[PDB]
Design a protein around this nucleic acid. Structure first.
Ligand SMILES: [K+]
Ligand SMILES: [Mg+2]
Ligand SMILES: [Mg+2]
Ligand SMILES: [Mg+2]
Ligand SMILES: [Mg+2]
Ligand SMILES: [Mg+2]
Ligand SMILES: [Mg+2]
Ligand SMILES: [Mg+2]
Ligand SMILES: [Mg+2]
Ligand SMILES: [Mg+2]
Ligand SMILES: [Mg+2]
Ligand SMILES: [Mg+2]
Ligand SMILES: [Mg+2]
Ligand SMILES: [Mg+2]
Ligand SMILES: [Mg+2]
Ligand SMILES: [Mg+2]
Ligand SMILES: [Mg+2]
Ligand SMILES: [Mg+2]
Ligand SMILES: [Mg+2]
Ligand SMILES: [Mg+2]
Ligand SMILES: [Mg+2]
Ligand SMILES: [Mg+2]
Lengths: 64, 101, 66, 146, 132, 63, 99, 138, 85, 202
RNA sequence: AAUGAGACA
RNA sequence: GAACAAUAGUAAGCACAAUCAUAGCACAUAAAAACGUUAGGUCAAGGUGUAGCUUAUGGGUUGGAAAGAAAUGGGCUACA
């Protein structure tokens, strides 16, 4: 699954660029903490399970 | 068709009560007041009892709009307890969740 | 200024507040002595709920075997 | 107008005509059911009231033979009902207003004494010498500029 | 044993979607409500009328799209307009889908006397979350 | 204000005591329209007009 | 309680619209009868039952028009067909036990 | 590059009637999920700041409704299934808001209201004394 | 009584009775295999007993470059179609 | 048969303006959202499900149409339909000085085919008595006449009207009560001299 | 702390 | 079908576990608890197989289901 990881890595960087574009911030310093607060705003999911909320992180950290 | 013959009778009972709701209110006002002469009140009792039996608010029965269960019905949702759980457990009712505390 | 609860709940609450408020005026060494006596630790004992199908929090109805 | 789903997004100009007209036929198909069975949509829970969602009626609401009922058929784009009822009114001896007669002629003249285009029930001169428009025009007692 | 809205374990050959794979006690913990409206708030009235209309749409959409419906509908009520979100399989030709979309939008609007929005998302097959 | 609808009533008998209670209740009623309120007042006029002999033997003469 | 208090209480009642003259406890019910909407006229009462006749008739007509397909009604018809094939159907009027 | 040139055409007829002044406007949004209310508050605050309203936001305490129903369809009354309805509150106060500005702010807020929440508006309109009181009449 | 109806899968899951306690320890000696029939095997979306030709579902939308309209079916024609089913 | 076209996410520009894609509130379209978002509880050894064919991302009320970029653009266009609050009415104390009457009204919005809420007919009128022209005798009579509607600490008078079906009728009725109470507190009627020493407030 | 089972493979 | 100074077992699925709720954590309580057992309970929530009724086991109106010799279970109030 090496190629699948590589595909996830490249599209995550592209997806990060789109999120920075719509958020109106600097894409060079669009840190992960900024991404978490951005996702929590665009998709306000009210659920008690902390792991059930929408996430968009590094595929290396997500995939085992 | 309503789900049962019992439900059909309730619809007729509610319809009859609505037609005579205003007439009963005017007559019942005379009875419930002690300043009017007692002779007039006795005549009022005869007239109010001469109305059709089905035109009585007390005879109205609250059932479930789905299965027409005569009891075990929540007034807010007008649903039986069995039907209410069936809709709630599938997540089809907004803001309804299993209580945990 | 204490609000809510009974006579003992207010008395215990005021006791806990004074212990925390007096730590400023007392040296650090006796603050440790305050903890060892239980003054500074809040009481976690709260009234429990009533389970559905039981008379009280723990008591159940009479169990007729036969 | 079209769905954002890729399977439903049109792929060519030929698809656009087919897709859009299919949706347009759906509105006509549904409105046919609404008008066919008015009693199934008389319930109203709209507050404030929305007169653009209530079912419409095409059959004459008044089945009696009278001048007032005749005007309803003219306004409901009915040609055969109007001309038959107008003849009955004339045979009854009751007078008919000239403006109503002119209004009847306008409906017949535009469609050539025919029905309009409904959901469901070029070369050459479409006008005919043997037409009801000329017949009624001669029968008019007083003829104005209009 | 509890049996409300559950699918029993039978080897590992029966696919289950995300909605059906969670027990009812996971509501508001792992999955949200299929319908959202103001009726079931604290101090709001008009709750029974919303419920009966919700049930009718569960029965109307299921019968309007036979076989091609993927899973349960999602009903959103904003202002006086009603939004219906559906997942539909690739079964009918696109001509029939637009016919049903136009038929559903007009018929429901003139029945509930409120504007209706019908948005569709098409998937190749039922999405599988566990087993399979 | 519904006093203008009580002109044709006995000013001193129990009818005035009864009618003013009805008007006071109708004043506090938000769910009833003005035309509907007059119907209740009119019905009382009809009811008392039809039954006149019973009021004669009631013990007090009422107009 | 003084005569001054009686005048003030009645004067306030006249302005705000309550009953001025003294009224019995039971005699206050007639005011309540008209002040509140009667139970038989509340929207919760006469509109309690959804109109199942319209719901059932509309879907039955749509079933025959091919716009709505009901699985449950198809199940009854399929099983009813098998009963007729097996020879056990519903007799006509006047055929139950008189023969 | 190709854009519709000047596609804006609104009209604002300034009449001679004085505008209505509101002392303080209160908006109370209620919903089931905190996340929606948290994002909705951010949207309202951002729009309010741009218009120059100087609003203050506080969270009223929540309340929980519970009720109990029987579990089985026959007997077995010692086993119960409970349910819970949670309504979360959020209040946004508006101070020194004109009538013209109040109309646009509310309609812009109301149109973007999420389907899972509702709100109540408490407007404290201020005005001078009535004519009879102001004009000396004994 | 529209709300009283159920789903096809629910009806067959109950009629077959292939999940009760009878078929556990040989209690069921019926020996006759009950068969489940899919009632959607023959479906024509739009076709009905009254025989309405809806443009888009059964009949083609465009005919000779002209879009068809709603039309019914002849009594003899409808009988043959039903006889085909 | 018919195939599935590639999603427009591939054709989406890097620097395109987002609000043009979503002008109004719309459900989450997986093809129309370039953001790769995963939600849902993951498997024991796995990752949360993707954004295509996921109902969890569809139930949530999205805020894609209220992006901060769009909010500034939306609000700026609305700045034309506004009028400035007077600068002299800065302190709340001056507001009472220049406007002594405040009226409370409520409007309710809920999801449904109807807007008729019976609780929206209430009108609350509050007036500070220190800003009126009551005399020593008239003010004492007004307090004794209005009953419990007057607060002795904040010196505020509250009038609540609910009988009128509409808010405008209640508003006209609420102001009617205020003026009739003022004109009556100045009528020293003949029976007023029959005061009891136990009824005196001082 | 003696007794109990019938038309279940 | 196991021996850890290891002698035939292996990696996943469900359940337990962990997590979540009771607005800090902790503890505690809730909630959960598979596959099966008792042909356990419910044709009277509702649907439905098979069998039965069809001027009747169907529908409507009016009036009426009393009463405790006695035995027992769970409760409230007491015997200060
Ligand atoms: K049966
Ligand atoms: Mg039945
Ligand atoms: Mg009762
Ligand atoms: Mg105890
Ligand atoms: Mg069973
Ligand atoms: Mg023996
Ligand atoms: Mg194994
Ligand atoms: Mg384990
Ligand atoms: Mg915890
Ligand atoms: Mg624990
Ligand atoms: Mg437990
Ligand atoms: Mg556990
Ligand atoms: Mg048994
Ligand atoms: Mg047993
Ligand atoms: Mg039994
Ligand atoms: Mg039955
Ligand atoms: Mg039985
Ligand atoms: Mg049967
Ligand atoms: Mg009988
Ligand atoms: Mg005993
Ligand atoms: Mg007990
Ligand atoms: Mg005692």
């Amino acid at each position: 699954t090496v190629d699948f990881i590589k595909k996830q890595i490249e599209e995550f960087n592209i997806g990060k660029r789109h999120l920075a574009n719509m958020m109106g911030e600097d894409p060079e310093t669009f840190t992960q903490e900024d991404i978490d607060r951005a996702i929590a705003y665009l998709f306000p999911s009210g659920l008690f399970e902390k792991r059930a909320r929408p996430i968009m992180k590094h595929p290396e950290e997500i995939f085992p | 068709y309503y789900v049962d013959w019992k439900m059909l009778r309730d619809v007729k009972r509610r319809k009859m009560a609505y037609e005579y709701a205003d007439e009963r209110l005017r007559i019942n006002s005379l009875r419930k007041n002690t300043i009017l002469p007692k002779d007039l009140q006795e005549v009022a009792d005869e007239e109010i009892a001469s109305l059709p039996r089905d035109s009585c608010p007390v005879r109205i029965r609250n059932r479930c709009v789905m299965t027409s269960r005569p009891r075990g019905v929540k007034r807010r949702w007008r649903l039986s307890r069995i039907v209410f759980r069936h809709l709630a457990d599938h997540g089809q009712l907004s803001g309804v969740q299993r209580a945990m505390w | 200024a204490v609000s809510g609860g009974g006579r003992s709940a207010q008395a215990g609450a005021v006791r806990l507040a004074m212990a925390r408020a007096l730590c400023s005026f007392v040296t650090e060494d006796e603050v440790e002595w305050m903890r060892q006596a239980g003054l500074l630790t809040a009481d976690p004992r709260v009234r429990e709920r009533k389970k559905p199908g039981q008379e009280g929090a723990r008591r159940k109805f009479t169990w007729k075997k036969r | 107008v079209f769905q954002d789903d890729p399977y439903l997004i049109p792929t060519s100009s030929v698809e656009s005509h087919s897709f859009l007209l299919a949706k347009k036929s759906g509105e006509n198909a549904a409105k046919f059911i609404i008008n066919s069975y008015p009693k199934y949509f008389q319930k109203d829970i709209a507050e404030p009231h929305i007169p653009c969602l209530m079912p419409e009626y095409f059959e004459p609401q008044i089945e009696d033979v009278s001048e007032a009922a005749l005007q309803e058929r003219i306004k409901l784009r009915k040609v055969k009902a109007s001309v038959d009822m107008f003849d009955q009114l004339l045979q009854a001896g009751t007078t008919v207003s000239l403006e109503t007669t002119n209004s009847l002629l306008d409906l017949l003249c535009y469609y050539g004494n025919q029905e309009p285009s409904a959901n469901y029930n070029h070369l050459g001169v479409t006008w005919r010498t043997k037409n009801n428009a000329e017949r009624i025009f001669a029968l008019m007692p007083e003829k104005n500029a209009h | 044993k509890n049996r409300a809205a559950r699918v029993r374990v039978s080897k590992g050959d029966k696919p289950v979607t995300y909605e059906e794979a969670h027990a009812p006690h996971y509501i508001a913990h792992r999955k949200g409500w299929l319908s959202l409206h103001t009726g079931n708030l604290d101090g709001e009235d008009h709750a029974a009328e919303r419920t009966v209309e919700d049930v009718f749409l569960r029965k109307f959409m299921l019968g309007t799209f036979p076989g091609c419906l993927a899973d349960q509908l999602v009903l959103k009520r904003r202002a006086n307009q009603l939004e219906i979100c559906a997942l539909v399989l690739r079964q009918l030709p696109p001509h029939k889908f637009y016919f049903l979309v136009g038929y559903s939008e007009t018929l429901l609007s003139h029945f509930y006397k409120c504007p209706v929005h019908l948005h569709l998302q098409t998937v190749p097959s039922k999405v599988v979350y566990k087993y399979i | 204000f519904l006093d203008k609808y009580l002109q044709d009533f006995p000013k001193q008998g129990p009818i005035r005591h009864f009618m003013e209670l009805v008007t006071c209740g109708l004043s506090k009623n938000p769910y009833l329209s003005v035309k509907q309120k007059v119907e209740h007042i009119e019905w009382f006029r009809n009811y008392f007009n039809e039954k006149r002999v019973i009021l004669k033997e009631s013990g007090i003469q009422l107009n | 309680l003084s005569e001054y208090a009686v005048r003030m209480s009645r004067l306030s009642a006249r302005l705000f619209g309550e009953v001025a003259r003294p009224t019995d406890s039971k005699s206050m019910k007639v005011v309540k009868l008209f002040s509140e909407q009667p139970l038989a006229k509340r929207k919760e009462t006469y509109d309690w039952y959804p109109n199942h006749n319209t719901y059932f008739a509309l879907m039955g007509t749509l079933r025959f028009l091919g716009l709505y397909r009901d699985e449950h009604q198809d199940f009854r018809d399929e099983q009813l067909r098998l009963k007729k094939l097996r020879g056990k159907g519903k007799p006509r009027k006047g055929e139950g036990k008189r023969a | 590059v190709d854009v519709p040139k000047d596609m804006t055409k609104p009209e604002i007829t300034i009449s001679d009637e004085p505008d209505t002044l509101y002392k303080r406007l209160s908006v109370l949004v209620k919903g089931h999920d905190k996340a929606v209310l948290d994002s909705y508050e951010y949207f309202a605050v951002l729009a309010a700041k741009e218009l120059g309203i100087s609003i203050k936001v506080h969270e009223p305490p929540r309340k929980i409704e519970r009720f109990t129903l029987l579990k089985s369809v026959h007997i077995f009354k010692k086993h119960r299934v409970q349910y819970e309805m949670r309504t979360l509150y959020r209040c946004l106060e508006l101070e020194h808001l004109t009538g013209s500005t109040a109309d646009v702010y509310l309609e812009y807020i109301q149109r973007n209201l999420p389907e899972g929440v509702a709100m109540e508006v408490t407007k404290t309109k201020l005005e001078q004394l009535p004519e009879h009181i102001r004009k000396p009449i004994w | 009584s529209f709300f009283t109806k159920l789903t096809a899968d629910e009806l067959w899951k109950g009629a077959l009775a292939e999940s009760g306690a009878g078929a556990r320890k040989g209690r069921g000696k019926r020996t006759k295999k009950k068969r489940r029939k899919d009632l959607n095997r023959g479906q024509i979306i739009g076709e009905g007993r009254h025989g309405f030709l809806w443009p888009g579902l059964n009949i083609p939308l465009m005919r000779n470059g002209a879009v068809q309209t709603i039309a019914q079916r002849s009594k003899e024609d409808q009988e043959k179609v039903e006889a085909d089913m | 048969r018919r195939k599935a076209l590639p999603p427009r996410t591939e054709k989406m520009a890097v620097d395109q303006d987002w609000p043009s894609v979503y002008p109004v509130a719309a459900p989450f379209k997986p093809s129309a959202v370039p953001l790769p978002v995963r939600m849902g509880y993951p498997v024991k050894r796995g990752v949360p499900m993707a954004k295509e064919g996921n109902l969890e991302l569809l139930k949530i009320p999205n805020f894609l149409h209220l992006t901060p970029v769009a909010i500034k653009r939306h609000c700026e266009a609305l700045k034309d339909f506004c009028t400035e609050w007077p600068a002299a009415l800065d302190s709340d104390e001056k507001c009472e000085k220049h406007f002594p009457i405040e009226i409370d009204t409520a409007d309710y919005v809920s999801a449904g085919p109807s807007i008729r809420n019976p609780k929206a007919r209430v009108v609350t009128l509050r007036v500070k008595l220190s800003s009126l022209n009551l005399d020593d005798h008239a003010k004492k009579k007004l307090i004794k006449l209005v009953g419990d509607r007057y607060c002795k600490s904040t010196d505020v008078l509250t009038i609540k009207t609910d009988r009128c079906p509409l808010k405008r009728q209640n508003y006209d009725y609420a102001v009617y009560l205020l003026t009739v109470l003022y004109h009556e507190s100045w009528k020293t009627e003949e029976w007023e001299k029959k005061k009891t020493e136990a009824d005196m407030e001082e």
